[PDB]
Amino acid sequence: PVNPCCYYPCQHQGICVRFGLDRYQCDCTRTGYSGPNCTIPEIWTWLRTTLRPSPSFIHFLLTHGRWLWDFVNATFIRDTLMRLVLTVRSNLIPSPPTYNIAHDYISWESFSNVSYYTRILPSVPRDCPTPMGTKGKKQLPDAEFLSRRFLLRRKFIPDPQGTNLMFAFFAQHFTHQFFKTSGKMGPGFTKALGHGVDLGHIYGDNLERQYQLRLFKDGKLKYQMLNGEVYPPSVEEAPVLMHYPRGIPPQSQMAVGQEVFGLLPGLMLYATIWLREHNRVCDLLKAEHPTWGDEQLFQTARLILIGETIKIVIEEYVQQLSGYFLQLKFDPELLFGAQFQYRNRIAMEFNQLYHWHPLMPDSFRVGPQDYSYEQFLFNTSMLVDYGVEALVDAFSRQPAGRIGGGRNIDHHILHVAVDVIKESRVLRLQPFNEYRKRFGMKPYTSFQELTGEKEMAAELEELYGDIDALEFYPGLLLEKCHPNSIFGESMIEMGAPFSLKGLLGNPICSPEYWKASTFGGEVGFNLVKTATLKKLVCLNTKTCPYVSFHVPD
Amino acid sequence: PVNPCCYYPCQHQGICVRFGLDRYQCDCTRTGYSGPNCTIPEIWTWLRTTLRPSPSFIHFLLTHGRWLWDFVNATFIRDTLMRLVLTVRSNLIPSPPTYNIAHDYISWESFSNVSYYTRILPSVPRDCPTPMGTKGKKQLPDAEFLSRRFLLRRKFIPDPQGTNLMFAFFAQHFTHQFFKTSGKMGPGFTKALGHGVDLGHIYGDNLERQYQLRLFKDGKLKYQMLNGEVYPPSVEEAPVLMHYPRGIPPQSQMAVGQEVFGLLPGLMLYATIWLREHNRVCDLLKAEHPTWGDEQLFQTARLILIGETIKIVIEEYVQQLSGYFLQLKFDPELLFGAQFQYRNRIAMEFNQLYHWHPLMPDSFRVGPQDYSYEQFLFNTSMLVDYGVEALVDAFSRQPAGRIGGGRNIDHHILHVAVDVIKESRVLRLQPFNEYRKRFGMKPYTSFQELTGEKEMAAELEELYGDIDALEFYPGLLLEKCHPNSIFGESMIEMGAPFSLKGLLGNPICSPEYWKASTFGGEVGFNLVKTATLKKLVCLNTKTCPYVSFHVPD
């Protein structure tokens, strides 16, 4: 027979279940619909559905009333929308989490084995006719081809939104504390337990590595003055694992917390900035609390950074990305009246989606210099050579690149992209269209609709044969972008629900933890309530260069 | 100086914090009070406080209107009270959790290191004058003395509430899936990760031990027919760790999931009952879903047992214990409208409190026989000798013993009790009185008040010197009981908030997970919605003996 769940009969998040030898059932519990496949709207849902404006429209309101917005901004209406934006967006991520690479059903194991990345949608049944279930060709497009043909960059297409490189890295740095696929266990597993913003890419992802990094005195972290400025410590004091190439394992071979952070000045840069911050947070605290030991000073300053990060990521990172006129705001109390689980579990689909490699430019301008990938990659003096102030000022000036539209992934890194498309298949993520539904959107009816153009469109059809067959990672990049937007519709509609669920689902954001004593003192609490990119930098330097998630001018 | 937090200046859950060299501050955020020590009621709190009846009174209403109750029982008023009972009780356990044996403050570590048991109240500062902080003698009563003098049983005082042994064990069995203090790491740490009702005392507490126990076919568990009846499998097929004494490690040396369950027929008994159930749940499922593999059949049946257990524990276990006329009810939906975190972390204070060793009788009647501890303990044929039906019928007939009042802990096990009092000190739990406050009660003003009598009372004063010095585990047993109640006031007022927070905080109880598809089919869902002690037994036997948490007649 043909495993009925292969057609994806259940709609609106209904659970498909095999019953007997060839039949199935949809569990439409709390889906808002009743019916064999959850297709009959309840009295209200019907109301909801008929009165709900398109995401297309909403994204239009948020990006146009440059007046209605300055006003809505200066009032509570701002908080109302924030509290709205949040709740609604987050209400889409099943929490407690649901499935993993091993189970396409709820299990105690899935719940408790932190190692497993979690999936929003189950996987395409190993017995389904086509690779994607029902429609498509017996073979998905050779990802080697698919890549170079549509994702390989020809002419560097800069991000119309002004995004710069200073953002490009922070983005990379920041995302590598929860995305850490285990080579050993393979796709669908993560070393980054804690699944969130625990800065385990600073303090490391294990007590030992932390200890090996911890200078167990004043709660601070180790480090070394090179040129007079503070930098991370080398393995020769911070005896901990890394990935620096076999060459000078002693000097300029720094320990950070995120094993791979030596392979690019940008990563080590920020890494330095944060460490420089932590110890800075310790200096303040210690003054406020002399009767405090090392353990406290450490943990508390950590929280002050888990805070600061969650604030900058929201009021500055997501802001820039959003392009909204609405001025996002981070105030955990906005949900104290909602039903909101304070727990997160990174998702494989949220992982793929975050592969914004096309951000990375052609070369790397640094004042008059202009390092190439060979020069840049694995370099190890650039950072201490140029100094933080300077290097920051350099990224904050060179633009990043459009992430959507297609064809804008530098060739050097284009390999990554091909592997993502290969893993996605290993994982068996359902069709791009199937994810559109799940994330409150309409399934595309044609490639011509997917893509703004006609070329890539026809050609893709030729390959996938049927729009529904189309894949997750590819569609997400081959999709037409909102005019001037850094990326298309599906990226935000799918990204935000994962992002905000993650940002606010953080324990520190809960009523329980959100007090001034959790940051010991009022001082701690304010450092979180007022963090800035500009402050994370200029408060840990000698001079204040230029820094922002967008190019000046 | 004297560490100010040693006086416990902060009231109503206010957080004490050292500021400078000798001063402190109370963080009264959301405590309902403002003021240097959180002593000034907010407009509402004041309302709340003035209009709130005593726990003494409430426990009186719940245990008296044998008419007003039969009525309130047959109506929604029942659900209202349940939903009330729950929420309110659970609102007392800080979740996300707060501190552990290592930190008397919020920390990312405390949050994430599952190993650590969690504490409700911080610990008595290592620098405080007295052992308990401010009041008392330079030395706590020699726990060896304290025990034998007030906890050592003289004449067996049976539980007025009718509780029997069939309950005594289920209680023990059930509580050992979350209470598993690590000899290695020591007091304040637990092997039982998952901190809850995950039946990791059946399927074991690690994937391997599970696998070693799993018969990887039909999702069932291994086992062996002895006499014709099904029993657990020996290490010779279920190659897994245990603690059976060095003697006959081959035959009648059974593997269960809970390492220690061989050391008492009662434990192995239930262990058998549940296993016998699981495989039973598999037989049903498999019929409903032939197209199902082993992994599914396993996980799903597991959930059906995590369910069943949470139902019997609530509508029958807590019921009997409660003595309420209100008929408790397990229906997860009752909280779907409340703000309730679906996560739990066992607490050291909840651990101590659960040391109901005085339950265990003098000997063990089994029809005409009458095994002693020597005979009973570590026996290994009694179970297969007598057969489940019979042994169940035997415990369900012999009474248990009052848990409170003092002096009712058999001598054989009295050692346990002395260690509990020793560990409590290792842990540094604050004074019994300090916990009364924290759990919505008034601090005792004298031993004469604590205890109903005058003797133990005076004598104890002589020892502790000041009521406030009194300890946690001791007060909890030396406290006078509610007339006819199995134990005093402080046990329920402190136990329920830990219990219900734990029972409903279970992932399966959440909206997300509480669907019929999580138990695959409607059949699964009903097995959970209708479990009984009587069914957990008589549905896994040849004949239906007598079974209940109370003696017949």
Ligand SMILES: *[C@@H]1O[C@H](CO)[C@@H](O[C@@H]2O[C@H](CO)[C@@H](O[C@@H]3O[C@H](CO[C@@H]4O[C@H](CO)[C@@H](O)[C@H](O[C@H]5O[C@H](CO)[C@@H](O)[C@H](O)[C@@H]5O)[C@@H]4O)[C@@H](O)[C@H](O)[C@@H]3O)[C@H](O)[C@H]2NC(C)=O)[C@H](O)[C@H]1NC(C)=O
């Ligand atoms: C999260 O989840 C992942 C898995 O998704 C966990 O990692 C995996 O863990 C398993 C077990 O720990 C591991 O197992 C693999 O399977 C091999 C097969 O084993 C054989 O077949 C059965 C299995 O039980 C046995 O009957 C066999 O007989 C043995 O019995 C004797 C008993 O003493 C053995 O001593 C003797 O060897 C005999 O053969 C036999 O065991 C297994 O042999 C091998 O270990 C292999 O690794 C997976 O490989 C793990 N890796 C992954 C990523 O899949 C992970 O632990 C979970 N996370 C946490 C912390 O809970």
Ligand SMILES: *[C@@H]1O[C@H](CO)[C@@H](O[C@@H]2O[C@H](CO)[C@@H](O[C@@H]3O[C@H](CO[C@@H]4O[C@H](CO)[C@@H](O)[C@H](O[C@H]5O[C@H](CO)[C@@H](O)[C@H](O)[C@@H]5O)[C@@H]4O)[C@@H](O)[C@H](O)[C@@H]3O)[C@H](O)[C@H]2NC(C)=O)[C@H](O)[C@H]1NC(C)=O
């Ligand atoms: C939950 O939390 C518990 C702890 O509360 C965790 O278990 C404990 O884990 C720690 C570390 O893993 C372990 O450490 C103990 O401390 C000894 C002291 O170590 C020395 O002093 C410092 C410490 O970092 C170092 O500077 C010293 O120098 C070393 O540096 C070299 C670097 O390569 C070393 O190779 C070399 O040996 C050198 O001496 C030195 O390390 C430590 O030596 C020893 O391991 C000791 O065990 C605790 O003992 C653990 N046990 C407990 C229960 O306390 C647990 O892991 C957490 N749970 C999880 C899973 O997160």
Ligand code: COH
């Ligand atoms: C938006 C974030 C971001 C950026 C800017 C970025 C920038 C760069 C970059 C530019 C200097 C280079 C040379 C690389 C190179 C790599 N990246 Co990324 N990566 C990023 C997010 C990721 C993620 C996410 C993964 C997958 C593994 C994981 O962390 O789970 C990744 C994986 C890789 C891999 C391993 C193979 C694979 O999974 O395909 C290589 C090699 N990379 N990356």
Ligand code: COH
């Ligand atoms: C209400 C539950 C219950 C019962 C009926 C029970 C019945 C019995 C019993 C009767 C046949 C005997 C001989 C024992 C014997 C022991 N019990 Co318990 N125990 C119980 C709950 C506990 C807990 C809880 C612990 C502490 C360790 C842990 O599991 O974390 C414990 C610990 C012990 C220890 C280890 C030392 C210590 O911590 O003091 C011994 C020995 N015992 N127990």
Ligand SMILES: *[C@@H]1O[C@H](CO)[C@@H](O[C@@H]2O[C@H](CO)[C@@H](O)[C@H](O)[C@H]2NC(C)=O)[C@H](O)[C@H]1NC(C)=O
């Ligand atoms: C690593 O980076 C350094 C600079 O940080 C590179 O050295 C510079 O190279 C350019 C030309 O490539 C010279 O004009 C500069 O004067 C150099 N700066 C100094 C003073 O060192 C170096 O080539 C890079 N190494 C690698 C890995 O390619």
Ligand SMILES: *[C@@H]1O[C@H](CO)[C@@H](O[C@@H]2O[C@H](CO)[C@@H](O)[C@H](O)[C@H]2NC(C)=O)[C@H](O)[C@H]1NC(C)=O
């Ligand atoms: C283990 O339990 C068995 C019974 O299950 C004990 O054997 C019984 O002992 C009594 C007297 O103590 C006899 O009258 C019964 O006839 C015995 N039952 C049978 C048929 O074995 C045995 O003594 C116990 N062993 C230990 C550890 O003491």
Ligand SMILES: *[C@@H]1O[C@H](CO)[C@@H](O[C@H]2O[C@H](CO)[C@@H](O)[C@H](O)[C@H]2NC(C)=O)[C@H](O)[C@H]1NC(C)=O
């Ligand atoms: C529910 O979903 C199934 C799956 O696609 C629908 O399909 C079945 O019935 C169709 C309408 O008659 C046929 O075209 C299909 O052959 C048949 N396939 C399967 C999987 O059974 C079914 O109609 C849907 N029901 C509703 C109410 O729309």
Ligand SMILES: *[C@@H]1O[C@H](CO)[C@@H](O[C@H]2O[C@H](CO)[C@@H](O)[C@H](O)[C@H]2NC(C)=O)[C@H](O)[C@H]1NC(C)=O
């Ligand atoms: C707040 O708590 C402290 C701690 O007990 C109270 O005690 C201080 O002031 C008392 C009243 O004058 C004195 O008896 C104590 O010597 C002094 N001790 C400490 C720890 O400072 C304080 O009065 C309380 N304040 C209120 C408003 O009740």
Ligand SMILES: CCCCC/C=C\C/C=C\C/C=C\CCCCCCC(=O)O
């Ligand atoms: C789980 C830890 C935090 C992960 C998320 C942090 C950054 C994610 C990056 C982008 C977010 C998703 C889409 C980008 C544009 C802004 C999203 C829309 C905002 C909204 O409307 O709510």
Ligand SMILES: CCCCC/C=C\C/C=C\C/C=C\CCCCCCC(=O)O
């Ligand atoms: C965390 C896993 C579950 C732990 C709890 C299960 C059983 C606990 C035992 C006793 C509960 C506490 C007091 C006993 C009497 C009943 C409590 C009062 C009930 C109420 O009023 O809500």
Ligand SMILES: CCCCCCCCO[C@@H]1O[C@H](CO)[C@@H](O)[C@H](O)[C@H]1O
């Ligand atoms: C127009 C914005 C009004 C305030 C925010 C409303 C919620 C915005 O958030 C999101 O908007 C999307 C549309 O792009 C919807 O598809 C999502 O379901 C919704 O969560």
Ligand SMILES: CCCCCCCCO[C@@H]1O[C@H](CO)[C@@H](O)[C@H](O)[C@H]1O
């Ligand atoms: C309030 C609901 C009105 C009807 C639904 C929205 C009307 C169409 O909305 C349109 O959607 C387009 C798609 O991106 C945008 O480009 C347009 O700016 C917007 O006006």
Ligand SMILES: CCCCCCCCO[C@@H]1O[C@H](CO)[C@@H](O)[C@H](O)[C@H]1O
């Ligand atoms: C009309 C909806 C409320 C907000 C409107 C914001 C945009 C109004 O459009 C206005 O057009 C004018 C003509 O060139 C310019 O002078 C203004 O700068 C521009 O904001």
Ligand SMILES: CCCCCCCCO[C@@H]1O[C@H](CO)[C@@H](O)[C@H](O)[C@H]1O
């Ligand atoms: C009289 C019972 C009315 C319905 C249940 C109300 C909440 C009962 O529950 C508990 O009662 C205790 C009193 O013993 C209080 O101290 C606790 O704070 C409360 O949670």
Ligand SMILES: CCCCCCCCO[C@@H]1O[C@H](CO)[C@@H](O)[C@H](O)[C@H]1O
């Ligand atoms: C509605 C509030 C009325 C005033 C507070 C309760 C009145 C006293 O309540 C009493 O408490 C005693 C203590 O256990 C019980 O023994 C009595 O049965 C009860 O009547």
Ligand SMILES: CCCCCCCCO[C@@H]1O[C@H](CO)[C@@H](O)[C@H](O)[C@H]1O
């Ligand atoms: C009065 C509060 C409402 C419920 C009252 C339940 C208890 C009433 O007391 C009644 O006393 C009678 C005299 O012997 C007996 O016949 C009844 O069985 C007994 O329930």
